Design an enzyme around this catalytic site. Structure first.
Site, PDB file in Angstrom:
ATOM      1  N   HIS A 176       0.808  -1.218   0.000  1.00 13.39           N
ATOM      2  CA  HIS A 176       0.000   0.000   0.000  1.00 13.39           C
ATOM      3  C   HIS A 176       0.846   1.275   0.000  1.00 13.39           C
ATOM      4  CE1 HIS A 176      -3.303  -2.810   1.138  1.00 13.39           C
ATOM      5  NE2 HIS A 176      -3.953  -2.001   0.318  1.00 13.39           N
ATOM      6  N   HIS A 218       1.310   1.466  -5.863  1.00 11.06           N
ATOM      7  CA  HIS A 218      -0.070   0.980  -5.921  1.00 11.06           C
ATOM      8  C   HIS A 218      -1.021   2.124  -6.291  1.00 11.06           C
ATOM      9  CE1 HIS A 218      -3.841  -0.951  -4.957  1.00 11.06           C
ATOM     10  NE2 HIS A 218      -4.068  -0.103  -3.970  1.00 11.06           N
ATOM     11  N   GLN A 263      -3.709 -16.901  -3.565  1.00 11.70           N
ATOM     12  CA  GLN A 263      -4.092 -16.207  -4.799  1.00 11.70           C
ATOM     13  C   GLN A 263      -5.266 -16.874  -5.540  1.00 11.70           C
ATOM     14  OE1 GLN A 263      -3.307 -13.184  -5.733  1.00 11.70           O
ATOM     15  NE2 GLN A 263      -2.266 -13.184  -3.744  1.00 11.70           N
TER      16      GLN A 263
HETATM   17  C1  LIG Z   1     -11.464 -10.196   1.035  1.00 21.67           C
HETATM   18  C2  LIG Z   1     -10.123  -9.970   1.694  1.00 21.67           C
HETATM   19  C3  LIG Z   1      -9.404  -8.795   1.076  1.00 21.67           C
HETATM   20  N1  LIG Z   1      -8.201  -8.552   1.852  1.00 21.67           N
HETATM   21  C4  LIG Z   1      -7.490  -7.182   2.003  1.00 21.67           C
HETATM   22  O1  LIG Z   1      -6.515  -7.039   2.655  1.00 21.67           O
HETATM   23  C5  LIG Z   1      -8.008  -5.921   1.336  1.00 21.67           C
HETATM   24  O2  LIG Z   1      -7.718  -6.019  -0.065  1.00 21.67           O
HETATM   25  N2  LIG Z   1      -6.866  -6.768  -0.688  1.00 21.67           N
HETATM   26  C6  LIG Z   1      -6.150  -6.530  -1.682  1.00 21.67           C
HETATM   27  C7  LIG Z   1      -5.197  -7.526  -2.312  1.00 21.67           C
HETATM   28  C8  LIG Z   1      -4.474  -7.071  -3.350  1.00 21.67           C
HETATM   29  C9  LIG Z   1      -3.559  -7.872  -4.045  1.00 21.67           C
HETATM   30  C10 LIG Z   1      -3.368  -9.172  -3.685  1.00 21.67           C
HETATM   31  O3  LIG Z   1      -2.472 -10.089  -4.291  1.00 21.67           O
HETATM   32  C11 LIG Z   1      -1.851  -9.774  -5.514  1.00 21.67           C
HETATM   33  F1  LIG Z   1      -2.799  -9.439  -6.420  1.00 21.67           F
HETATM   34  F2  LIG Z   1      -1.197  -9.043  -5.373  1.00 21.67           F
HETATM   35  C12 LIG Z   1      -4.115  -9.671  -2.600  1.00 21.67           C
HETATM   36  O4  LIG Z   1      -3.866 -11.045  -2.273  1.00 21.67           O
HETATM   37  C13 LIG Z   1      -3.925 -11.300  -0.894  1.00 21.67           C
HETATM   38  C14 LIG Z   1      -2.997 -12.127  -0.599  1.00 21.67           C
HETATM   39  C15 LIG Z   1      -3.605 -13.304   0.192  1.00 21.67           C
HETATM   40  C16 LIG Z   1      -5.015 -13.208  -0.398  1.00 21.67           C
HETATM   41  C17 LIG Z   1      -5.299 -11.965  -0.449  1.00 21.67           C
HETATM   42  C18 LIG Z   1      -5.031  -8.819  -1.929  1.00 21.67           C
HETATM   43  C19 LIG Z   1      -7.678  -9.739   2.519  1.00 21.67           C
HETATM   44  C20 LIG Z   1      -7.990 -10.952   1.652  1.00 21.67           C
HETATM   45  C21 LIG Z   1      -7.346 -12.187   2.221  1.00 21.67           C
HETATM   46  O5  LIG Z   1      -9.376 -11.163   1.508  1.00 21.67           O
HETATM   47 MG   LIG Z   2      -7.491   0.800   0.476  1.00 20.67          MG
HETATM   48 ZN   LIG Z   3      -5.917   0.215  -2.768  1.00 24.42          ZN
END
Ligand SMILES: C[C@@H]1CN(C(=O)CO/N=C/c2ccc(OC(F)F)c(OC3CCCC3)c2)C[C@@H](C)O1
Ligand SMILES: [Mg+2]
Ligand SMILES: [Zn+2]
Ligand SMILES: C[C@@H]1CN(C(=O)CO/N=C/c2ccc(OC(F)F)c(OC3CCCC3)c2)C[C@@H](C)O1
Ligand SMILES: [Mg+2]
Ligand SMILES: [Mg+2]
Ligand SMILES: [Mg+2]
Ligand SMILES: [Mg+2]
Ligand SMILES: [Zn+2]
Lengths: 325, 322
Positions: A71, A75, A280
């Site tokens: 973050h 990003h 993922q």
């Molecule tokens: C619904 C919640 C969402 N979350 C958040 O913290 C807020 O947004 N996330 C953004 C995010 C962005 C990129 C990610 O990987 C790559 F695309 F980079 C990514 O992969 C992670 C890595 C383990 C799986 C989730 C998450 C936590 C999640 C476990 O389930």
């Molecule tokens: Mg945010």
């Molecule tokens: Zn964001």
């Protein structure tokens, strides 16, 4: 130099944003926002002085944390540039006003500013000052908005100085509505509503969507920025892998603080017990694909290549997980 | 010095709260809260040290502004005591847990703390730091919560120190839910949803409400504290008359700030063009009667007298329109 060469892909999904970060001296948000503002002729349309824009952008970028692995300002630039591509999707041609466009891009630029690298739930569970201030509700997202707007007050930073009162009020409202929608605890509700919007959508003759009230317009912009925020798995594998590295580093650092505090370690935050591929694939199956598949429905066939990449990447990450045949 | 005779009406609609403020050296909130906690045995139930309760109350009371005519510590005391009465209504006998009871009373106590005496819309229009902080949404109510909770952290002020972790979490959530619902901008929706609950209420034979889950209970608590917040026109007229004088004084002062900055003067904040009596009647007709009529439905017939007083008071202001 090469930077102007890389910035030629600015209208393209899959911009080498990490490369731009290196080449710009870690100013991806500044150069990418500036480039897009020039591209969309926004400085002229809203009489924004270039020195003002750059001053604000540099201050804004400064307020993303360099020590936060995911973050950060990279990003931010990525979400800005992705939103910039989605805005230009043919199904949406001449749908949005210049002000609405400005709002969506500015929202993208500030949407994670001063992110501390830990989740809302963490902030709530550790009784943080942020959670106290915001009463446990969209704690980070309210904070991103507050800082993003606050920085407009700095010297020679008001990029909106020459908007009318009405325009500034309308823009502030739209940006708030957009960034609050990036709160993941609102994802299922946004999605459920977007599905219903898709079911009853209205299109012209040349195939562009008809959005005839603020409520429909803002809903589309909210989901657009939300998609852009969740767009990593839809990018070429070389970019995607890099984003995945950073999010897991950030999570594992959160996990470390949790373990040190004797707290239950949050999901995917335990460096010892965690699979990239499994996390993922789950992420895509339960969050990212349900959303992008709905967006693709909305703008069909505009997003089919994006959807194909997503499905390819999903197939790719599941391939090394043993499974019953 | 007593005062004790006045506090004997703490269980009654129409407690002499202005008298209590005078008799207590302007500590109506501390005194009434302390009285209600003792009466409901909340100190023993939650192991709240009495000096900790008093210390927190005095600090809380100090953060209501003396120079604000209506949204001050007397209004907080009033809303606390009014909620205290509503909680004891027969239709709600044994419905709420002690923690829920604690939550409603605590929420009432903090629900306007550090009120500056101007509206959310004024804070938004003037680009205040507060509206900047809270993104123009429930700006005051978000602020009231933050301050009420923050004050628990001052020396010897944590009245919730002996709740379990689960109890603190649950109480925190209820208090937030309750105070955010005092935002007048949520009134039409809250009321609409209250009517829906009333349409399908379940009661025992003796008329006691049957609430099923957190949604039901918190919805009743939200509306209850909202009714308490909007209870002035249902009180004995002399009380109501003073509340009216106070709210107009505060509104006029906001109007003055608006006029001075060349802003459009907010509705009913222009002392040069006001119709106080006419505005109370409209207030009752369009906001306060529709709410209390629905509440009275929910707890039928517990609120009949309250409703009757409301209607008598409407006629007072109607007959004093010049
Ligand atoms: C619904 C919640 C969402 N979350 C958040 O913290 C807020 O947004 N996330 C953004 C995010 C962005 C990129 C990610 O990987 C790559 F695309 F980079 C990514 O992969 C992670 C890595 C383990 C799986 C989730 C998450 C936590 C999640 C476990 O389930
Ligand atoms: Mg945010
Ligand atoms: Zn964001
Ligand atoms: C600054 C203002 C704030 N505002 C509010 O609604 C706030 O809530 N009111 C509580 C209230 C409480 C008691 C009132 O009378 C008696 F009961 F005291 C009372 O009399 C109203 C008000 C003038 C006649 C109708 C109002 C409305 C906007 C114009 O901007
Ligand atoms: Mg009991
Ligand atoms: Mg209030
Ligand atoms: Mg029920
Ligand atoms: Mg009579
Ligand atoms: Zn109040």
């Amino acid at each position: 130099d090469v930077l102007a060469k890389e910035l030629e892909d600015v209208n393209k999904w899959g911009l080498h944003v990490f490369r731009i970060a290196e080449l710009s001296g870690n100013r991806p948000l500044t150069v990418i926002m500036h480039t897009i503002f020039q591209e969309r002729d926004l400085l002229k349309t809203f009489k924004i002085p270039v020195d003002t824009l750059i001053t604000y952008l540099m201050t804004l970028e400064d307020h993303y944390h360099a020590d936060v692995a995911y973050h950060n300002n990279i990003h931010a630039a990525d979400v800005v540039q992705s939103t910039h591509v989605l805005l230009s999707t043919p199904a949406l041609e001449a749908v949005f006003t210049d002000l609405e466009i400005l709002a969506a891009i500015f929202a993208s630029a500030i949407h994670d500013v001063d992110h501390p690298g830990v989740s809302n739930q963490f902030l709530i569970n550790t009784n943080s000052e942020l959670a106290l201030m915001y009463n446990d509700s969209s704690v980070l997202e309210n904070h991103h908005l507050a800082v993003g707007f606050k920085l407009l007050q700095e010297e020679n930073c008001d990029i909106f100085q020459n908007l009318t009162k009405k325009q500034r009020q309308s823009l502030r409202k739209m940006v708030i509505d957009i960034v609050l929608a990036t709160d993941m605890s609102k994802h299922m509700n946004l999605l459920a509503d977007l599905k219903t919007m898709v079911e009853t959508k209205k299109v012209t003759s040349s195939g562009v969507l008809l959005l005839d009230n603020y409520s429909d317009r803002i809903q589309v912009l909210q989901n657009m920025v939300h998609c852009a925020d969740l767009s990593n798995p839809t990018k070429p594998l070389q970019l995607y892998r890099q984003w995945t590295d950073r999010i897991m580093e950030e999570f594992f650092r959160q996990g470390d603080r949790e373990r040190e505090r004797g707290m239950e370690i949050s999901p995917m935050c335990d460096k010892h017990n965690a699979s990239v591929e499994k996390s993922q694939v789950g992420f895509i199956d339960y969050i990212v694909h349900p959303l992008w598949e709905t967006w693709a429905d909305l703008v069909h066939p505009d997003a089919q290549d994006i959807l194909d990449t997503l499905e390819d990447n999903r197939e790719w990450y599941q391939s090394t997980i043993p499974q019953a045949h």
